[PDB]
Amino acid sequence: SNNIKIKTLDEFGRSIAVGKRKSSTAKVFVVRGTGEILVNGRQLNDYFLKMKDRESIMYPLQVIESVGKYNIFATTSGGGPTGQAESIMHAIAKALVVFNPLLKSRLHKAGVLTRDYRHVERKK
Amino acid sequence: ALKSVPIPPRKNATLDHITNMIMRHGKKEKAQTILSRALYLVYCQTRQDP
Amino acid sequence: KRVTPGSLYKNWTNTTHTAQLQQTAVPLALPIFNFDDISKTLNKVVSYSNKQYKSLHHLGSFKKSQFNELFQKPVCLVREDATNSFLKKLVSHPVKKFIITGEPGVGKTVLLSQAHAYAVDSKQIIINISYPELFLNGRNDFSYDDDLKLFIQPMYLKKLIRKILKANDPALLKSIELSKDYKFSNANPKNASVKPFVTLNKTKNTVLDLLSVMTHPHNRGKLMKAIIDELSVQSKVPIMFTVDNFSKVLTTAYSAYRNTENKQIYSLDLQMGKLMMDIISGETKFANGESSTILAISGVDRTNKTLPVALGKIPVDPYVTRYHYEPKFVELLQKGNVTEFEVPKLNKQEVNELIDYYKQSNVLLDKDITGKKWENLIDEKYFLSGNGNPRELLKSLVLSHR
Amino acid sequence: VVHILGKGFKGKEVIKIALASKFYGIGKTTAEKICSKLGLYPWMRMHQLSEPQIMSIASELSTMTIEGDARAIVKDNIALKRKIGSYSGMRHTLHLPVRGQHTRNNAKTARKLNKIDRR
RNA sequence: AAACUCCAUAUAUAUAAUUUUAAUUAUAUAUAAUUUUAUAUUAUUUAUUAAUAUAAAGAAAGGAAUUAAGACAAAUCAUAAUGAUCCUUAUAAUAUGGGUAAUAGACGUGCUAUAAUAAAAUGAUAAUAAAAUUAUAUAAAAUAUAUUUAAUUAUAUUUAAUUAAUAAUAUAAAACAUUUUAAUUUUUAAUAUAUUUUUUUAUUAUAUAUUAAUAUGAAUUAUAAUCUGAAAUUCGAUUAUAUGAAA
Numbered sequence: 001s002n003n004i005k006i007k008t009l010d011e012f013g014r015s016i017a018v019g020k021r022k023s024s025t026a027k028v029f030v031v032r033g034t035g036e037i038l039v040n041g042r043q044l045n046d047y048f049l050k051m052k053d054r055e056s057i058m059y060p061l062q063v064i065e066s067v068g069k070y071n072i073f074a075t076t077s078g079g080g081p082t083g084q085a086e087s088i089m090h091a092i093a094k095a096l097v098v099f100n101p102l103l104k105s106r107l108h109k110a111g112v113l114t115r116d117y118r119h120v121e122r123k124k
Numbered sequence: 125a126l127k128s129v130p131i132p133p134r135k136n137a138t139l140d141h142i143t144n145m146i147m148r149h150g151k152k153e154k155a156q157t158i159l160s161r162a163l164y165l166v167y168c169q170t171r172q173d174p
Numbered sequence: 175k176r177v178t179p180g181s182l183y184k185n186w187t188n189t190t191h192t193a194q195l196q197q198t199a200v201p202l203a204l205p206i207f208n209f210d211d212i213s214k215t216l217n218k219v220v221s222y223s224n225k226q227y228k229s230l231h232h233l234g235s236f237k238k239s240q241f242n243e244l245f246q247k248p249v250c251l252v253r254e255d256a257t258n259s260f261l262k263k264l265v266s267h268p269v270k271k272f273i274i275t276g277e278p279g280v281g282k283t284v285l286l287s288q289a290h291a292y293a294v295d296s297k298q299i300i301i302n303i304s305y306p307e308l309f310l311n312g313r314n315d316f317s318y319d320d321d322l323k324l325f326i327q328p329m330y331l332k333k334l335i336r337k338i339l340k341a342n343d344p345a346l347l348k349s350i351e352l353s354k355d356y357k358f359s360n361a362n363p364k365n366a367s368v369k370p371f372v373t374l375n376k377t378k379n380t381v382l383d384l385l386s387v388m389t390h391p392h393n394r395g396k397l398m399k400a401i402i403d404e405l406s407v408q409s410k411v412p413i414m415f416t417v418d419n420f421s422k423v424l425t426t427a428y429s430a431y432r433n434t435e436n437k438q439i440y441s442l443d444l445q446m447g448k449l450m451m452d453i454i455s456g457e458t459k460f461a462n463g464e465s466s467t468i469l470a471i472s473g474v475d476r477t478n479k480t481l482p483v484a485l486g487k488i489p490v491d492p493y494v495t496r497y498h499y500e501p502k503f504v505e506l507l508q509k510g511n512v513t514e515f516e517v518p519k520l521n522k523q524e525v526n527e528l529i530d531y532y533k534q535s536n537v538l539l540d541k542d543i544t545g546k547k548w549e550n551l552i553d554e555k556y557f558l559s560g561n562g563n564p565r566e567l568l569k570s571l572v573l574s575h576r
Numbered sequence: 577v578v579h580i581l582g583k584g585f586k587g588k589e590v591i592k593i594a595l596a597s598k599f600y601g602i603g604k605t606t607a608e609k610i611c612s613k614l615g616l617y618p619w620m621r622m623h624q625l626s627e628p629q630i631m632s633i634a635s636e637l638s639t640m641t642i643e644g645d646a647r648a649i650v651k652d653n654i655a656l657k658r659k660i661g662s663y664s665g666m667r668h669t670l671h672l673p674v675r676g677q678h679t680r681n682n683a684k685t686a687r688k689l690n691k692i693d694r695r
Numbered sequence: 696a697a698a699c700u701c702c703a704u705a706u707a708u709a710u711a712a713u714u715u716u717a718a719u720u721a722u723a724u725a726u727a728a729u730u731u732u733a734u735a736u737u738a739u740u741u742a743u744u745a746a747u748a749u750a751a752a753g754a755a756a757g758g759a760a761u762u763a764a765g766a767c768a769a770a771u772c773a774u775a776a777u778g779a780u781c782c783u784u785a786u787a788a789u790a791u792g793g794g795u796a797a798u799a800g801a802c803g804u805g806c807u808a809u810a811a812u813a814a815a816a817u818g819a820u821a822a823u824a825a826a827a828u829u830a831u832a833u834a835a836a837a838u839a840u841a842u843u844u845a846a847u848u849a850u851a852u853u854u855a856a857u858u859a860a861u862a863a864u865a866u867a868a869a870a871c872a873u874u875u876u877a878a879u880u881u882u883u884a885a886u887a888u889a890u891u892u893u894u895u896u897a898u899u900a901u902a903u904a905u906u907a908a909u910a911u912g913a914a915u916u917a918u919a920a921u922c923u924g925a926a927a928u929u930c931g932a933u934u935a936u937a938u939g940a941a942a
């Protein structure tokens with residue numbers, strides 16, 4: 001038989017997904033809201049100083065034009081600012097598919113559902 | 125509603141190319157700051173889109 | 175020379191501040207700031223009045239790195255949760271001693287500028303210390319006064335006294351007749367060699383005359399003590415004493431100045447430090463009951479346990495080293511009953527108003543106006559600004575070319 | 577130009593930095609103590625000094641071991657090494673490194689400067 | 696041979712009484728791709744086709760190992776081992792000290808630097824890592840001195856915890872913000888001035904030399920102190936004050 005069980009929102013209406021980039025990992029909680037984001041309990045502008053990192057986090061929501069329709073509670077650890085910001089980006093994209101599985105094709109086409117494989121390679 | 129909306133562009137190709145040419149040693153943030161500050165000064169003297 | 179009369183030779187932050195780049199901005203007609211009619215300007219972008227702009231420029235209310243050059247003159251959003259809330263407490267609270275806090279770039283300086291604008295309208299005398307670092311960095315002269323037992327800073331005091339004279343209405347200053355007779359040494363280059371001293375008799379001369387006394391650098395500390403005493407004894411005019419970037423004072427207990435034993439001088443051994451903390455602690459009491467003391471912190475300064483403990487946000491930890499905890503400042507702040515007012519972040523509706531003003535000012539890029547729905551822009555800029563930070567909002571709009 | 581004990585200084589030069597730059601034997605720490613002792617504020621510049629203050633600097637500088645006196649102490653310590661016949665003294669005489677440096681390569685600065693009558 | 700593999704990656708199951716906590720993890724087992732399908736175009740050996748694009752599905756994009764033959768009679772008798780030949784009161788063995796660190800020139804490989812798209816300070820409810828190490832140990836916090844309120848840095852005193860998913864080495868750093876920065880009169884100061892006030896403008900003073908070495912650079916050298924060791928002279932490391940070369 002198959003090993004895939006339909007993903008569904010939890011008891012509090014939250015979609016939980018994990019993402020990885022380089023050495024970083026991110027676990028995000030997406031719920032329907034008004035665009036409030038918290039990264040490790042801190043404001044987005046506090047945790048991520050680079051605007052390009054903030055723009056990466058927003059991109060999946062910008063693809064489905066739902067930037068003001070969800071509250072994101074992102075928790076990230078490991079690597080640096082870029083790995084964490086893009087790991088959160090990847091995790092938000094995977095968590096948005098539960099709210100509307102018809103938008104998976106658009107998320108895949110934008111490239112936010114593809115796990116970036118590049119990592120530091122020991123010189124050979 | 126989304127079927128007829130083009131996927132928004134991840135980045136500007138020209139600005140990204142200019143930024144990487146300015147950048148050295150992987151210090152992209154400094155390169156982006158220099159370009160953004162320069163383009164901010166162009167807007168403040170021409171009052172057009174830099 | 176390599177530098178021509180109009181060449182932009184400074185760095186970017188100073189060029190934007192000093193290069194007069196607002197000249198090309200488009201004149202817009204905005205309502206005027208008036209707290210007595212806030213109902214008509216609440217949640218709307220307003221310019222200041224002509225009388226307020228003149229006073230606030232002389233006080234140093236507007237600072238560099240505030241994107242003021244984008245607009246013809248500096249503008250402010252009259253907010254309900256920040257501007258209206260704070261100004262109502264200032265008019266009602268009996269103590270009227272506040273310290274404005276909040277995350278870096280949240281708008282603490284703009285709030286203080288709106289309190290200065292209110293004071294100008296409400297016929298008050300404003301004493302502002304915009305950049306306390308100037309009397310703590312050791313870049314101006316200092317001298318020890320035996321009669322005051324304090325280190326006076328003549329160069330700094332000369333600038334401060336002129337700011338108090340040029341920023342405040344002469345009529346208010348003239349109304350305050352002097353309570354004591356004062357004698358100073360004459361430094362006026364016209365009659366200095368004819369008149370050894372200049373006398374200010376009581377009930378005849380005013381505080382306006384006192385602020386125009388040209389004295390020698392060694393007697394300028396005694397002139398600052400007279401001005402403060404005269405303003406603290408009179409009950410006619412309320413005195414609003416303000417200090418921006420007060421976090422610098424709390425975190426720099428020892429100035430860069432060194433005494434004759436090569437020992438750094440404690441900040442409370444300077445007249446500026448002693449005077450500032452005497453007004454905050456309550457040692458210097460003002461007769462008028464509408465006098466206030468509004469302090470504001472800045473995110474450019476380091477943080478430590480001093481301010482949080484003084485505000486009651488954390489318990490006192492006695493084993494914290496003095497470099498991260500100054501118990502003397504905590505005692506002074508708690509003796510003055512200073513209360514905290516945290517500036518809240520912007521809500522999405524306030525972001526909408528600011529972005530609608532920016533569109534009319536022609537400061538928005540073409541990628542945010544053409545092919546983008548207005549609702550999408552507001553949602554995106556509210557997300558990219560950290561859910562309300564005004565400074566991150568402006569940067570996302572005018573300083574993000576990626 | 578401000579002249580202190582013969583040395584000439586450009587007006588804009590910071591006093592604490594200028595003193596440690598033109599006077600042999602005075603470094604950053606020593607210069608700061610002189611300025612602190614004379615009541616000069618940390619970032620005061622030479623053009624600001626008055627003639628009474630220029631004389632005060634010369635007085636404090638004349639009560640220290642600087643210039644010839646300081647240079648003589650080094651020349652006399654080096655001469656003592658040669659007089660006692662220590663290995664280090666011979667290195668100074670031969671214009672060779674005196675602190676264990678290899679000589680198969682490099683050793684160019686020791687060749688130009690190592691000498692009994694060291695500058 | 697290639698593949699079949701192993702690693703990485705994605706997913707599933709199992710394990711943890713979720714205080715050895717990182718469950719955003721650990722590591723056992725299993726699955727997955729050497730991707731697949733549809734359509735148009737251009738070529739073809741024109742058909743059940745390749746090159747292309749377009750659409751759809753997908754996390755899927757990278758690596759290692761994987762053996763046969765020959766040559767240079769290429770390196771190694773100094774990792775150890777073998778034959779021949781030579782030494783056997785010495786070409787074997789031990790101790791003390793010295794040398795391998797010498798210095799004309801030359802060569803290879805590195806480090807640091809020659810300033811403003813770049814260096815220096817400061818950033819305590821402490822921005823953000825990974826992989827390793829600790830019974831022939833890793834050493835916390837505190838205190839004392841350099842040394843100044845304190846911090847920082849170095850060492851001493853003392854020796855908490857941990858022989859470890861537990862405690863320690865160890866608050867990563869750059870980043871980012873503020874301040875500062877010679878050449879540079881592009882500065883600073885004294886007056887006056889301003890609706891640029893951390894700032895503008897005006898008038899005076901602010902040097903001379905100068906193709907040049909500064910508040911760049913840190914070689915060389917003096918003195919004092921410290922660390923390891925039984926021992927730091929030839930010939931070790933660190934710190935402070937002073938010295939400040941070439942570039």
Ligand SMILES: Nc1ncnc2c1ncn2[C@@H]1O[C@H](COP(=O)(O)OP(=O)(O)OP(=O)(O)O)[C@@H](O)[C@H]1O
Binds near residue numbers: 239
């Ligand atoms: N009410 C407002 N209306 C318009 N602009 C505002 C308002 N409040 C803040 N801003 C803008 O936000 C930016 C930051 O404002 P401000 O300097 O007052 O912040 P701050 O918290 O005092 O900053 P810091 O922590 O650096 O001292 C500026 O560009 C300012 O013009």
Ligand SMILES: [K+]
Binds near residue numbers: 596598599600601
């Ligand atoms: K010197």
Ligand SMILES: [K+]
Binds near residue numbers: 676
């Ligand atoms: K040697």
Ligand SMILES: [K+]
Binds near residue numbers: 681
């Ligand atoms: K060599």
Ligand SMILES: [K+]
Binds near residue numbers: 713716718
């Ligand atoms: K856990």
Ligand SMILES: [K+]
């Ligand atoms: K040896």
Ligand SMILES: [K+]
Binds near residue numbers: 810813814
């Ligand atoms: K540099």
Ligand SMILES: [K+]
Binds near residue numbers: 867
């Ligand atoms: K770390």
Ligand SMILES: [K+]
Binds near residue numbers: 908
């Ligand atoms: K030099």
Ligand SMILES: [K+]
Binds near residue numbers: 927930
């Ligand atoms: K030795």
Ligand SMILES: [Mg+2]
Binds near residue numbers: 282283284473
């Ligand atoms: Mg501020």
Ligand SMILES: [Mg+2]
């Ligand atoms: Mg050979």
Ligand SMILES: [Mg+2]
Binds near residue numbers: 795
């Ligand atoms: Mg050798």
Ligand SMILES: [Mg+2]
Binds near residue numbers: 821
């Ligand atoms: Mg941390």
Ligand SMILES: [Mg+2]
């Ligand atoms: Mg310790």
Ligand SMILES: [Mg+2]
Binds near residue numbers: 821866
């Ligand atoms: Mg840190």
